[model samples]
Target: KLANGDIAIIDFTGIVDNKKLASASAQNYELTIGSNSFIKGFETGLIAMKVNQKKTLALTFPSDYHVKELQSKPVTFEVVLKAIK
Candidate 1:
């Protein structure tokens, strides 16, 4: 279990769709913009994030990831902190 302000490492190496992530977020927990809940290494990196703070994340997918096109590719994200529970 994760706390409101705790940083967690998220591994979305094989999860490519944002919509699916949103759905999971809504179903599982209160979703925040910079929480990094669904993406790999996102939450972990956000461990010390403060309210209204934002950061960008660089992530690398696994070589054998399910998404062939994105496998082993580097992806960047502009994360914004919307709120905290």
Candidate 2:
């Protein structure tokens, strides 16, 4: 299981109101749990994830999100945990 401070490799797709947001999707992404590199609620949802497991995180963009179009929008991140280090 992944934990805070663990480095994870993942494949993820982000959707806003059922529409895919290409800018928010990536494969083989290197992420650090507890790192704030991602948007609010993103890394938090990654904690306790398991390798090769698929999980969905329902989150809302911050009201002041950098991307105006995504600001305050409800988004879903479909995440596939690929590896943990």
Candidate 3:
């Protein structure tokens, strides 16, 4: 099968660190990495991780995220490595 982008659903149920989220955004916005970069903690969590490795990632969203419904939430991600290349 042809590989595309990886998909992960993160669940935030508690208080989230805004700074971390901003940092993640900055990494993408500044072109330090790339666009649509993995949400907070997602990319960092991927560091040193391998394909098909399932892991529970801890992440935080911005307190002032455009989507108030999801802002500032501490979430756990049920990640799946869909592809590597």
Candidate 4:
């Protein structure tokens, strides 16, 4: 299972509310938990996730977020936990 400081190799795709997304998945994306590299509610959602587990993050981007379209939008991410490094 992924722990607080583990590096996670994950594949994830984000979709806007009731909207479709294509090719949003990251391949072998590595992120350390608590690294603050990802947006709010992103990295933390993988906490305690097991290897090869499929999970979902129902999250919202902050209004002042970087992306113009994604700001304050309800986004859902389909996440696949690939490995814990």
Best by lDDT: 2
lDDT of 2 by residue, 30-52 (tens): 88876667676676566666787
Query: TM-scores for all candidates?
Result: 0.43, 0.80, 0.46, 0.77
lDDT of 1 by residue, 1-85 (tens): 2344543333222223332233112212235435443445555444445544444555555545555755655555444433445
Which 10-residue window of candidate 2 scores lowest in summed lDDT? 40-49
> In model 3, which range of ten residues has the least summed lDDT?
25-34
Off by over 4 Å in 3: 1-33
Residue pairs with backbone overlap in model 3: 11-75, 12-75
Model 1: lowest-lDDT 10 consecutive positions: 19-28
Model 1 stretches astray by more than 4 angstroms? 1-39, 63-66
**Per-residue lDDT of candidate 4, residues 1-85 (tens digit):** 6766778777777766556476345656787877777776677777667878776776777656666776667777777876666
Once fitted onto the true fold, the runs of candidate 4 whose alpha carbons sit more than 4 angstroms away are 22-24
Model 3, 1-85: lDDT tens digits are 2122432222212323323333222211111112355454555454335545554555556555567755765655444433333
Q: What lDDT does each candidate get?
A: 0.42, 0.73, 0.40, 0.71
TM-score of model 4 relative to the true fold? 0.77
Clashes of each: 5, 0, 2, 0
Cα deviation in Å at residue 6, candidate 3?
Answer: 10
Q: For each candidate, C-alpha RMSD in Å?
A: 7.8, 1.8, 9.6, 2.2
